[PDB]
Structures are given as structure tokens and as C-alpha cells.
A paper describes a structure:
SurE is one of the several proteins that gets expressed when bacterial cells are subjected to environmental stresses and in the stationary growth phase of bacteria. SurE has been shown to possess phosphatase activity and appears to be specific to nucleoside monophosphates. The StSurE protomer has a Rossmann fold like structure similar to those of its thermophilic homologs. The crystal structure of StSurE reveals that the C-terminal helices of the two protomers of the dimer are swapped.
Examination of the sequences of this segment in StSurE and PaSurE suggested that D230 and H234 of StSurE might be the key residues responsible for C-terminal helix swapping. The activity of H234A was only 5% of that of the native enzyme. The structure of H234A StSurE could not be determined by molecular replacement with acceptable scores using the Phaser program and StSurE monomer or dimer as phasing models. With this truncated model, a solution with an LLG score of 905 was obtained when two copies of the truncated protomer were placed in the asymmetric unit of the H234A StSurE. The final model of H234A StSurE consists of a dimer in the asymmetric unit with 244 residues (out of 253+14 N-terminal tag) in chain A, 252 residues in chain B, seven molecules of ethylene glycol (added as cryo-protectant), 248 water molecules and two magnesium ions. In both mutants, the two protomers of the asymmetric unit are related by a rotation of 167°. D230 OD2– H234 NE2 hydrogen bond is lost in the mutants. In chain A of H234A, D230 carboxylate is hydrogen bonded to H228 ND1 (2.90 Å). In the mutant dimers, the hinge regions of the two chains are closer (Cαs of D230s are at ∼ 5 Å). This leads to the formation of several new hydrogen bonds involving D230 in H234A (D230 O/A - D230 N/B (2.85 Å) and D230 N/A – D230 O/B (3.04 Å)). The 5% activity of H234A might be due to the presence in solution of a small fraction of molecules with a dimeric organization similar to that of the wild type enzyme.
Author numbering:
A (entry chain B): 1 to 150, 152 to 253
B (entry chain A): 0 to 199, 209 to 252
Write the structure that this text describes.
């Protein structure tokens, strides 16, 4: 099996390195990842710019200031030969759940993979410690794909930050929007300045049975068959009719 | 009358948001909640479990320190504007948000965060850096249009305004998002040191703007399919638990 492995956290990240080592047990892996951490950066293709690459002794390739999508696009069309069987993104440091999948770099890489024509998977750890757990989950998932090739959608995977033995299973999920347990909690700093803290005062619950949120709350691996489509083709007529009805733009 | 949460991507100081704010305060109740800095080229995720500091300006505008556009809208909608906003408006952005650019756009991200409100959210971008007055006039017309006849929610309108005087705007068209990406390729290049450097429709938003029309694209969040949910679940139960 041939894997194009990228991430959002960059080539030296523990998530991608833990995943790369576990995958090389059964698969041939090409890493093409950003040269540095990209979590805070936009995830679009860098158009009309000459991107420099760096090749390490182990074969990993770093794209200088490349986004996750740059890495997949350059990997597919220039850097990886022979071409990959599947594009993998992760393991991300932190969850990619609900509305955040629209904005996630980890997700964006997998999406670019699918747009280019390859099966694609994105993996995220809901925490900071148990990358081994997330690695084991990804390997088991990729085993299944080798045995039974699969949808023109990506698989968005979220893993609880727990030892592997405590993960209560794997669920096929839909995406939530924002978590009902998250709240705006007012805070003050030592200087008396106003601060706001977004999240749960206690445990995260009431998320909804089949959401990606709930699955992770209940200690389950969340798997979402995902395709970020923002278009609203059915709404075109209703907006047209509304503009004529109220006469918007007809008063200039 | 209307309660408008106004945010953007360019930050609280941007000429686009400042022009728009002034215009909207003529007929509406406006609260600015915007990033403390320009966020173009930054990611748009929600900042969870990390305290966000706010600055309040003399005029009542609120800046969120290291706040993403979604942080601003989330905070505005749920804490900073009371009673709750009827609508989120995001812009006026300096530069277009057309076609392939909309997914990663901070301007559109802010609107998307405000999509569950009483009115659909507006993301407004000027196709340039000059005629902010035009884009503000367009936004005002849209808002009044929603007052007279409310349009349904869970949705946003992505609005791109041509960088022209208002008298030169040819009209307003409902469009779809274009895509120039299925035409891109990779052309290698030679550095002076030697190393290789790699280089990457009539109803489209691009076309409307190019022809001097304001582009209005309805957007909706669609992520999953019920048939995909079934085909993955049966694919999972093919290879289950075990102890092997
Ligand atoms: Mg990251
Ligand atoms: Mg901007």
C-alpha cells in the first residue's frame, strides 16, 4: 500500500511521526508536510508562488511555507512517484469536530486528496498525550481499506485522548455545528481586564446521539464520511425572487 | 431598529468595517466585535478553552485579542450583544471573496458562524480597496430588503461588490461559486543556487463582478449524506471487534 502522508502541524510533529512509523509496518509511506507548524495559518493552495522543497535522509519532504493543501497537491502532481493509493492527514494535535471541519487544515489536506481523485483520510487526537492510540486506530482503519476498498468522500476521524484499551469503540457519525455544552464564561485577569473563555464548565454532554461531538465524549472513535460542500444550488431561485420582490438594488 | 453584530477578517481598524459601521448606525443598532489585528492568511477555527481578552474603544467597538472571526461572532452572538443580534454582517472585506477562495475566507467564516440567527448572515467583500462607500450602500439595501420581507435562515449570502462608484454598478445577480483550480498545474523552476522551486462561466461570481454587477451567492453548510453513513457503517461491521 502506498500512502501520501501530510499534516497541518508540520513534518517534525509527533502526530505525523507516530503515524508514519506505525504505517511503515505494512505500507510504503511518502511524507510531504509543511516545513513548520501551520495550525494558525490559512489552508488554501498557494497560487503563483515558487515553493522550495527539502528532502531529509529518511525520505520525508518538507514544503517551505506550504499549506496542507500545497503539500497534497505538490505530492500528487510533482513529488511522489509512483502515485499514492491513499492520502492520509494527521494525526492532528487537537480535535477536528463540528463546524471546525470546514476550517481545519487536517481536513483540507484530505479534501485536496479527494479532489485530485484519491481516497483520503484525516485523523485528529482529542488531546495531547495518546498518539499511540490514534496511530493504532488509523492502522486498523487502513487495514480495512486494503482488504475492502471504499465513497468519493473523505473519512474524518477523531480519537479520544485515552490509552488504547479504554477506547469504547468506533462510530459512524455526522458533524455537529457547535457543542451545546460549550459556554461563554466571563473571566477576569489579575489586572481586572475582561476575558471570555469558551467551553464546558464541567463534562461535555447533550451533544446528540450520532454527532461527532458525542462519540468522542463517550470515549468512542468518531468516523465521519465527509465532503465540505458550501454551495446552495436549490436556493438560487428563492434569492432571485426575493431580490425582485423587495426591489433590492432598484433604488440607486 | 435591527440589531446587527458587525465583524470582519481585517480587524477592528479596517476602513471596510469602519465605513460600513458608520452607514449602518444611521438606521440600525450596531455592535462591532472584530479581531484586534488583520487575520488574512490565518486559520478560522473557534478558540476553545482559552481565555480571549477584549479591548473596548471610545465608540463602543470591541476588539478581540488574537480572536478569530468565528471567535468574534461566537462571542458577539452569545455574550457581547444583549439582546441577541438579529443578524451577523461580516465586512466590508478589502479584496474579493470569490469562487475557490470562499472556503478558507475569514470574512465568509464570520458569516457562517452567524448563520443560525433571525436573519441570514451577510459576508461583504469589495473587489478592490477604494469604493467602500459602494459596498456599504449595497449592504444597506440588502438589510432593508430583509426588514420588509424576511428571508429564511440557517444560510448566508456571500456578497461581492465591484470596485466602482455606485452609479456604475450595473445591477445585482444571484451567482454560483467559480473554480479556477481544475485548470492549475505544476511548473518546476530553477533557483540561482540550483535547487528546484515548484509553481502552482456565465453564472459564476467571477463573471458577475467582472461585468460590473454585485454578486450574491447563497451558501449552506452541507457535510454528510445518509447513504454515505450507511455504506461506511456496513463497511465497518465487516471487520469488527475480535480478540485475535
Ligand atoms: Mg494543527
Ligand atoms: Mg481579509
Amino acid at each position: 500500500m502506498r500512502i501520501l502522508l501530510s499534516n497541518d502541524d508540520g513534518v517534525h510533529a509527533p502526530g505525523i511521526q507516530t503515524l508514519a512509523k506505525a504505517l511503515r509496518e505494512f505500507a510504503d509511506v511518502q511524507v510531504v508536510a509543511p516545513d513548520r507548524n501551520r495550525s494558525g495559518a490559512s489552508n488554501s493552495l498557494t497560487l503563483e508562488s515558487s515553493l522550495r522543497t527539502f528532502t531529509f535522509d529518511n525520505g520525508d519532504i518538507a514544503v517551505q511555507m506550504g499549506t496542507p493543501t500545497d503539500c497534497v497537491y505538490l505530492g500528487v502532481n510533482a513529488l511522489m512517484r509512483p502515485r499514492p493509493d491513499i492520502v492520509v492527514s494527521g494525526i492532528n494535535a487537537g480535535p477536528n469536530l463540528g463546524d471546525d471541519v470546514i476550517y481545519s487544515g487536517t481536513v483540507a489536506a484530505a479534501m485536496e486528496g479527494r479532489h485530485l481523485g484519491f481516497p483520503a483520510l484525516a485523523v485528529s487526537l482529542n488531546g495531547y498525550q495518546h498518539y499511540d492510540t490514534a496511530a493504532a486506530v488509523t492502522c486498523a482503519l487502513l487495514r480495512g481499506l486494503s482488504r475492502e476498498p471504499l465513497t468519493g468522500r473523505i473519512l474524518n476521524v477523531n480519537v479520544p485522548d485515552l490509552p488504547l484499551a479504554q477506547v469504547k469503540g468506533i462510530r459512524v457519525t455526522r458533524c455537529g455545528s457547535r457543542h451545546p455544552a460549550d459556554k461563554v464564561i466571563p473571566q477576569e485577569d489579575p489586572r481586572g481586564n475582561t476575558l471570555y473563555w469558551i467551553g464546558p464548565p464541567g463534562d461535555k454532554y447533550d451533544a446528540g446521539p450520532d454527532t461527532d461531538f458525542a462519540a468522542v465524549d463517550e470515549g468512542y472513535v468518531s468516523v465521519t464520511p465527509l465532503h465540505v460542500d458550501l454551495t446552495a444550488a436549490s436556493a438560487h431561485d428563492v434569492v432571485s425572487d426575493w431580490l425582485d420582490s423587495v426591489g433590492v438594488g432598484t433604488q440607486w
